[model samples]
Target: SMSYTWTGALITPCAAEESKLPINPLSNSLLRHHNMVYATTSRSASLRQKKVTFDRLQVLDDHYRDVLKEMKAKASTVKAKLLSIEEACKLTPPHSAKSKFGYGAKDVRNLSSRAVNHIRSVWEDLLEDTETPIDTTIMAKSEVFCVQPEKGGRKPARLIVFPDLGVRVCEKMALYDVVSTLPQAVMGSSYGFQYSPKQRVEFLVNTWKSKKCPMGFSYDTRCFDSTVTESDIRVEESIYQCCDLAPEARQAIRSLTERLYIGGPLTNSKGQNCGYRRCRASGVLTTSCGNTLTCYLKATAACRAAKLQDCTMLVNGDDLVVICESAGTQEDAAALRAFTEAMTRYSAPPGDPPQPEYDLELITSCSSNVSVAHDASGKRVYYLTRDPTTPLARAAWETARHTPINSWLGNIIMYAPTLWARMILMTHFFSILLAQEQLEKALDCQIYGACYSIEPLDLPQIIERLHGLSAFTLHSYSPGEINRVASCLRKLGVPPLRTWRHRARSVRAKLLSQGGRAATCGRYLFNWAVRTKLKLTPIPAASQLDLSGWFVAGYKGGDIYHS
Candidate 1:
């Protein structure tokens, strides 16, 4: 039983407390809607959980075996390249988090002898002391909310294991590229985030059309990374061993895993020894990569044992979506029960068992939900969306300080077509950025701690890469969504969608007049506002497989996928 406590300054106060509301009308809306969405999501999730708590059904067929075998063979052939100390250090971001060893990201990027020497020493020490497990510092992780709040007022403080900066560099040198390329190579389209929203929709549509009785659903594991046992960590090590590597690289990776990966000692803020972690650490270099591979491997194997039919899997880290052929009403329930048993036996039991969704269009993944509503012209529009609580919280933070996560920018890029995102997130953040005159500054953001430099103008290419060409034209929103957006705008002291539209006209004109990435960003991000819009140009790099294993599949629109 872990106790969650809110120990930081209140970024957004509880809505019920009127005394906490500042002079600004925006404060009331910002915090009020935040709490409202949380309550709505919490109640909904509770009911869904209760409904599935006693259900026992499973779906299995031989098609599952064939897919798993194919993926395993692909994983066997991967040969990841190892980079040198200098190369690895240079790859570290200039604005990346600092090390406790008195070295900053700038030091590593600049290849300072002090940083390099310190890093080399750390690597040497890790190699020498393979038996002793590494110790990690715990810190509170701040993030936005789309759905429910933790028992505390804030999201749970993830226990971060901060290794020495030099050791992190070594981890990068040995494992970065492998983690980048291996998962997708093994999982194919099943590797989440490999496709855009359009591609995902098309894949589901094709899959459903191709099958007689299609069963589609997603699975969630409770405390997935935390549930990864020591044995699971060793199993991950074994998977890594399958890859071809230089001898030193092999030794370095192995040593790193034993000392830091398998289990580590945790130290909290007050310097108290807070027991030991025998499970996977969320803060390590290998966390995402390790979890993705481990979860995929377990799932693929379990699917085979369960005899799932024509199963197509899309896994982004621990989030899983399975679209397969259904047996029948009663038979499908039995198959799902068997599937659940197999997964549990394989140490991957669901937080909630797989809940089959009949409507492929409504199934959500990666935060984006497939939703339909009428636009301003009353034309029915279908797009992916989630409650914009988290993005809104991030926008509020950006108004005050330079936060690391730009939820607003991400929502704009990924959920570009969502009514809430376009009308609220875009208007709020861009207005903030404009007011602050920080439009040209390339701020640092991360997918999963892997650093990316985002300029205000990069929105077009990012949007194109994520939502595809359709994002430019998807303008309709449901009246309910619009009303909520309008209410939120009024509460947050932001302009209405109509006002945003007017502002976009001038902004688009100004951006086009300037001509470049700025113009491109304006054309895509603000295309809905302007009479004439720009055509989407493909992002050359994004079109390829993302080598960094930082991206996850769900979070774009719906709670269904995120679960």
Candidate 2:
């Protein structure tokens, strides 16, 4: 079957889309090259459509079935409950799209009878009409990026196709608990979304060190979501079927899978029929879980087919990395070709071919790679860092425009120990906050899909809790890592490290002069700026943070937020 079949209709935009950075005074302060930053819009949706649409053929083998049975056996021990309509409604984001039946997200959350009655109708409709292809809105997702060196040309906007509000509520009611529990149970430590950024880095390091002559590689699946076959979707549903579930939950899951999950009709923002999808829906409750499961299964079988040894996979949705015992170079190359052949037969081929890397720092996954730096005690500390182009570009956008998600603060929180984040991001953003007197204001940023309201002054304690006191004192980064940061700074027209150092000194002084929490922020976060540093200590408030479910599961398209 085809990933998508397009009609003559075009994907229309609902509002004015900004393609380039708008003129704002703060833009140049963060990045001098204004034209270098751009946002993907509907204008390029056709190009994106060209890339994602394709045909697929998948043939399962004994290795795939063997892994599936193992996954299902673990899944059998877990039980999941169905969420009530009110519970699911409460889970909806306040800013989510309105239902076609007149009530908005606010009305749904308030549990108005209008919303309740419609939700009931939708659930019954799901149970009754299991064969109808549910309608979904297909729109171009506008995303920010810095122009890459290859004239990588603007990334065509990724399409987000989703059903209306009422059906979405039904999706959550049926599959929410299943997705949250079943993934961790089946994959265990192999589930990448189960770890915090700190935990993720630790897992990578430990996995690398555990093997003698460890060979690592990251596989980038070409449009992984599109590569999903109906059989693949049904196999995922079959795995979910193994879970001990409520009778209603089972019926709803079966109905939802047939009606919406397997395939759907795509409608444009103008209410015109755009196409049909027989592949993965990018904006469903099961998106992350389904992709993680499918990707893991294929990779697991492929590893077996290639006769690879002790493969340890880390999978978060479609992003995958494998660390395993190395064979000789030529043999490893031949093995990877076999793996690729098996994966292509399974319908999930790589976007870029995988290469064996003996060095952990050189193998990138989840858009991040492991790097080393020395702490104040001169102990080597491993931390994760990615190319700073996207982060800096998004930061520049946030400085100029108001957006719902604050990627800059999220980057700082997740990558606090990295040199680029601490020296460039924190220094740059904190200076603006100090000048504007918004230091005490709690700004919302998402870490692994859940939103966190963070205040600037609390960063010292937050970093201590998430990354430890060493985050404040880390320096002497690895030369390769340092070169990447320096190169990104030059490319983005960001101020040099020395210029940021000078700015940090001034910002540090002003923060210290304020005293209390602000003073603590200055003393801890900017210790790298001064030759004579304030004594680095663990934060007293770090233990008070409730970080229980912070990284336990991913909720990217799940419409989740912390209360």
Candidate 3:
């Protein structure tokens, strides 16, 4: 078993208000080990200390300092790489009228890749070049060693990790266009949203204070400054940590990036990490474990079910249940719509009495997609819109894709020391999501991948429309289109299930029953959820599943015959 510590310098217990709170259920499992200790903003009453107590210290020698030093040196090299890319862009932007990258704007993937490579190169170089010099000593007396870089580097690019969540907040900022607008609708309405610029300083300050580790070092305080404001959306840089984690952790992180790269990874299944069903439908994750803001939202879904007249332990204690629902499904649409509208109106369901909306108006329009920084007052905002004219939006898109796979890896390593087990456990979860996303895209891209344009609207209206928005494939679509698609897939066999949800569910169930692990079950459940969300046909019984050929193919030194 590996032993480690999870320590952040500044652990703010400040409520997020409109912003989502961070969570990790696996932390409980991690704490159970006795070897690893979990840190937090609050101290333990027993120790009279707020941070989590780490057990054994695995500190490396002074020679290892060279490893970090070398890593830092390489950071400049990567930054130079970006400068070169920028120079190239300056030379011949808009390579053509038709190209988003070639002509008008930088591609998100392209920029993100540049950042990722620049940083990963730094990591790899640190590993190779940071070896301590050999001295005249007994071989047994010395140990060859390496210390991995901390999550996110000494500093990170685009500090905010979840662009979608951030955009959700940005959508709110567009609404509170100005302070006077808030007074008109509701007394404190503007303060309720995460994007309200009134608390700009606090957002930056909180963000700035958050960068410090429990050790009391401010690694990246520059993210916050006196000049940041509502008009400027760059403050989100505080949340991101250029994490380049351990090998095992990296393996898990890589799985995530791969899924992202391939359009979507299997959300829950033997292949990737993510909550089982709850994650597949919405941006939320519903598994035994939770991390990321999406998990909180997913938890809310399960909590809702728990709150129903049918269940006990209700929403309060049932925060851990996994649910399967489709995106924009009639049920999902109604639920989410009501949820958002109620959030706007501050409505609470029957059993759960309604609470005050802070005497604020929820009049602001939400963008289906915008970037934000959530604080108690309102969401500090940014736009996720891929507009070429807006420098930040354009820059953000270019950055998301180009950010190195390793940097994300580093963050996981630093942020979640126990992610290895969580990741391995969740691998199948991600695989399920990836499978669904890929199948849908592949079928559609092959069928209708053409880019279509919508009429432009005012920024606020567009942001409002985009905010609190999620898409779903109709259940009617499943039977009308998916089941038929699955039948064709079934006729084609194996590779066919590799794409379609209907086929994937049936096939995955068959694979799972033949001595599959939890991951397999997760995959099955995931497909079922997607089907439900899309309103696809029902799934086959689990006991009826088959898996003999899965092994036979592996043993025969033959491929699974997939596309």
Q: Candidate 1, residues 1-563: lDDT per residue as tens digits?
A: 11111232222211221212133434332344433222121213223222222312233345444554565577789898887887787766665567777878888888888888898888787667777877665544444343343443533333344565677788877887677677777777777655555555566567666777788777787667655766667767776777888777788888988888876666654556655656666666677767776677777776666677898877777777778888776767777777777777655678777777777755666655566655444565556676565566556554444455565665576577787676566655665566556778876554433455677666666666666555666655556566656665554455556766776677667667667776675666777886655555565645664433335422211101000
Model 1 bad stretches (over 4 Å): 1-72, 146-155, 196-198, 371-383, 477-496, 502-524, 530-563
| lDDT, candidate 3, 20-78, per-residue tens | 11233222211112111111212222221111122221222232233333323432221
- How well does candidate 1 score on lDDT at residue 114? 86
Relative to the unseen true structure, what is the C-alpha lDDT of residue 232 in candidate 2, on a scale of 0 to 100?
A: 92
lDDT leader: 2
By TM-score, is 1 or 2 better?
Answer: 2
Q: Per-residue lDDT for 545 in model 1?
A: 43
Q: Give the TM-score of candidate 2.
A: 0.97
What is the alpha-carbon lDDT of model 3 when measured against the actual structure? 0.21
Rank by lDDT, descending?
Answer: 2, 1, 3
Better of 2 and 3 by lDDT: 2
**CA RMSD of all predictions:** 7.4, 1.4, 28.0
> What are the per-residue Cα lDDT tens digits for candidate 2 across 1-563?
99999997999999999988887636597898888899999999999999999889888899999999999999999899989987898878777789889998898899999998999999998778778788999999989999867876678999998888998888889888888888999999999988877889999999998998899899989999999999999999999999888887888889888888899899999999998999999888899899999999999999999998989999999999999999999988999989999999999989999998998999999999988888988998888889889999999998988887789999998899988898889998899888889999888888766666778788888889888889999988888888888898888889999898998999999999999999998899999999998888777898997877777777777666565
Clashes of 1: 29
Indicate whether candidate 1 or candidate 3 has the larger TM-score: 1
